[PDB]
Amino acid sequence: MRKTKIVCTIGPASESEEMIEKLINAGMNVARLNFSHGSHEEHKGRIDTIRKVAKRLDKIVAILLDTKGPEIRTHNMKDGIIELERGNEVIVSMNEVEGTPEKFSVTYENLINDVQVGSYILLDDGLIELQVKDIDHAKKEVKCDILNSGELKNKKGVNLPGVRVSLPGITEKDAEDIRFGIKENVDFIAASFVRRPSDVLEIREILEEQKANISVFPKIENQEGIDNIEEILEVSDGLMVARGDMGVEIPPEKVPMVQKDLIRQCNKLGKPVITATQMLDSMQRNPRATRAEASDVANAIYDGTDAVMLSGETAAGLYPEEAVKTMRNIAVSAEAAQDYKKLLSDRTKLVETSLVNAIGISVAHTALNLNVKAIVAATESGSTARTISKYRPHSDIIAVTPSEETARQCSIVWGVQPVVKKGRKSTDALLNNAVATAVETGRVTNGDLIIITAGVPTGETGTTNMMKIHLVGDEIANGQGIGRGSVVGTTLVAETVKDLEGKDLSDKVIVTNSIDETFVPYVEKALGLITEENGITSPSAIVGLEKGIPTVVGVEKAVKNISNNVLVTIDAAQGKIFEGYAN
């Protein structure tokens, strides 16, 4: 019962074997490595630690590699710092220059081809905004009106509020960074500043060369990306919503509504979504998060995020463990109080009709109606686990897989708790393994209902194409059931009529030889009835059907075999009797 997965950025505060252990124990599911900073040397060092500490603690943690991305910086500035007055003008040179309140240079020389008169330009993560007055293609200079007078340090960022910014999909560095991911069988690549399908395909063509198999998760940080969200997902394995970065190009006021609609669009196609940045940022400095921050995280969950990400809190914060522990607690709480009927009801309408989704909706409704304890999803790739996870059911999801990487592919998916069991061949084994695996988790015992979905035969696999509903054994006794109902209650083995005379409340299922006239007054006071032998019109059978009591007759040696005062469940249809609570 945890559902929403926790991604953590590893940094100086949490390279430590000792600390990486604590974070894993505190719920970390995926390790982010941010390639904005650090050398391959450093990143490789942390990867080894995570692997090592993971397989000592015998836990499944994924590695996520976050690229730096293309960007539009300012070039160097004169005296290190430069100022810009508020009603004034500035010239943005496409050619490199030293910074002056008049002449001022940007690294993306092709800016002049993207903007036009009236377009806004933002500097130092939106610290001070400019606006395009004139464009001169001879001199290649863009003359602008300064608006929010502020200082300007050296290599500070520039943002053009969409504006089809025409950078490449990936930088040369990124291209080398992602081959380093390829080298370490890294699990996830979060791609930066994505904004058209091209930008992903560029990563995927580098992957397909080394037959890489890594999941690619775009970072949608501007309008062009928001606008192209469907076509990006078409080509992507998942998605990341960087709010901080987004809040520069599109107004803070509007971001939460945008966020909702992105997450929505991922839930639709069953792609995992990571909600990123500005989660618990005050826990770099403090040991507990502020209310405004807690609210934020919750809304992340209500909106429908497969996962939640900690940035600086864990990488270079004074409280990292606390940051993860807290992240978890908020998760569990925010989930506890939400309606899985609504959640389903929303997804039932939202997703499309397909062979694969048919089984999704079947397993969803069924799990909800029959109140199943666990859905065990047998997958080689992970797409079943996802097809089940998109419909968001209360039931715990269990992704049994033979692939150690696809296990880690699932650590980020909502609801799914993956185990790695060596593959069976035939369905009949597949099913029995499922049941085994379910129980060995401690998550289900004998009373419980389990639904087993998988893609058989497991050769072609591809789509998931079947489900079995399964009550986890295993009938204590059986015989001929009269009536169709059922109940639970503690036995009262009565060897004679006087063996239950003055010591009688309701709430019990009596276990006798047969029913006399002396038994018939006591039986109707009870909850159930099990009788030793008998047929269908017998005194024992007939009395149960008359007074609406679920009964079983012809029960081999009920008085000897069935114990006294032990809780039991009787099933009128089927004619089975169980160890204590079932369905």
Which amino acids are annotated as binding site, given as ranges?
Answer: 32, 34-37, 66-67, 73, 156, 221, 244-245, 277
Report the residue count for the chain. 583
Q: Which of residues 270-299 bind a copy of itself (CB under 8 A)?
A: 278, 288-296, 298-299
Nearer to a copy of itself, 186 or 283 (CB): 283
Among 471, 526, 529, 568, the residue binding a copy of itself under the rule CB under 8 A is: 471
Residue positions forming the annotated binding site for K(+): 34, 36, 66-67
Tell me the closest approach of the beta carbon of residue 483 to a copy of itself, in angstroms. Answer: 8
Q: Which of residues 298-317 bind a copy of itself (CB under 8 A)?
A: 298-299, 302
CB 207 within 8 A of CB 182: yes
CB 314 within 8 A of CB 324: yes
Nearer to a copy of itself, 44 or 260 (CB): 260
Nearer to a copy of itself, 428 or 517 (CB): 428
Q: CA–CA separation, 271 vs 280, rounded Å?
A: 25
Among 16, 465, 513, 514, the residue binding a copy of itself under the rule CB under 8 A is: 465
Catalytic annotation present for 277:
yes
Tokens 């087993």 belong to 452
* 3 state SS of 58: coil
Catalytic choice (5, 32, 386, 576): 32
Catalytic annotation present for 219:
yes
Nearer to a copy of itself, 469 or 559 (CB): 469
Among 175, 435, 456, 476, the residue binding a copy of itself under the rule CB under 8 A is: 456
Tally Cβ neighbours within 10 Å of residue 535: 10
- Alpha-helical runs (H) found in 351-452: 355-370, 383-390, 404-410, 427-440
Among 195, 386, 470, 508, the residue binding a copy of itself under the rule CB under 8 A is: 470
Percent of residues in the chain assigned helix, strand, coil, to nearest 5 = 35, 25, 40
Contacts for 555-560: CB closer than 8 Å, 24+ residues apart = 555/477, 555/478, 555/479, 555/530, 555/531, 556/477, 556/479, 557/532, 558/477, 558/493, 558/511, 558/512, 558/530, 558/531, 558/532, 559/493, 559/495, 559/511, 559/512, 559/513, 559/532
Q: Quick one: 363 exposed, middle or buried, by C-beta within 10 A (0-12, 13-18, 19+)?
A: buried
Tell me the closest approach of the beta carbon of residue 247 to a copy of itself, in angstroms. Answer: 5
Q: Which of residues 523-552 bind a copy of itself (CB under 8 A)?
A: 535-537, 542, 545
Tell me the closest approach of the beta carbon of residue 280 to a copy of itself, in angstroms. Answer: 10
Tell me the closest approach of the beta carbon of residue 104 to a copy of itself, in angstroms. Answer: 24
Catalytic choice (74, 275, 277, 326): 277
Q: CA–CA separation, 114 vs 72, rounded Å?
A: 13
Using CB under 8 A as the binding rule, whether residue 359 contacts a copy of itself is answered as yes
Using CB under 8 A as the binding rule, whether residue 251 contacts a copy of itself is answered as yes
Question: For residue 508, what is the enclosing H or E element?
Answer: strand 508-512
Tell me the closest approach of the beta carbon of residue 470 to a copy of itself, in angstroms. Answer: 7
Catalytic choice (219, 271, 347, 390): 219
Nearer to a copy of itself, 61 or 398 (CB): 398
Q: Binders of a copy of itself: how many residues, by CB under 8 A?
A: 73
Q: Which of residues 42-81 bind a copy of itself (CB under 8 A)?
A: none
Tell me the closest approach of the beta carbon of residue 574 to a copy of itself, in angstroms. Answer: 5
Q: CA–CA separation, 142 vs 306, rounded Å?
A: 43
Tell me the closest approach of the beta carbon of residue 283 to a copy of itself, in angstroms. Answer: 11
Query: Hey, which residues does 259 pair with through a beta bridge?
Result: none
Catalytic annotation present for 51:
no
Nearer to a copy of itself, 299 or 445 (CB): 299
Nearer to a copy of itself, 121 or 449 (CB): 449
Residue positions forming the annotated binding site for Mg(2+): 221, 245
Using CB under 8 A as the binding rule, whether residue 390 contacts a copy of itself is answered as no
Contact flags string 423-452 toward a copy of itself, x per CB under 8 A: ---xxx--x-----------------x---
Nearer to a copy of itself, 27 or 99 (CB): 27
* 3 state SS of 141: strand
Tell me the closest approach of the beta carbon of residue 47 to a copy of itself, in angstroms. Answer: 27
* 3 state SS of 417: strand
Q: Quick one: 427 exposed, middle or buried, by C-beta within 10 A (0-12, 13-18, 19+)?
A: middle
Q: CA–CA separation, 336 vs 232, rounded Å?
A: 33
Q: CA–CA separation, 394 vs 1, rounded Å?
A: 9
Residue positions forming the annotated binding site for substrate: 32, 244-245, 277
Provide the sign of the torsion angle of the four alpha carbons 425, 431, 435, 441, taken in this order: positive
CB 315 within 8 A of CB 284: no
Catalytic choice (2, 44, 68, 73): 73
Q: Which of residues 191-220 bind a copy of itself (CB under 8 A)?
A: 197, 201, 204-205, 208
Q: Which of residues 130-189 bind a copy of itself (CB under 8 A)?
A: none
Q: Report how far apart, in Å, the C-alpha atoms of 530 and of each of 164, 176, 522, 555 are.
A: 76, 73, 13, 7
Catalytic annotation present for 195:
no
Catalytic residues: 32, 73, 219, 277
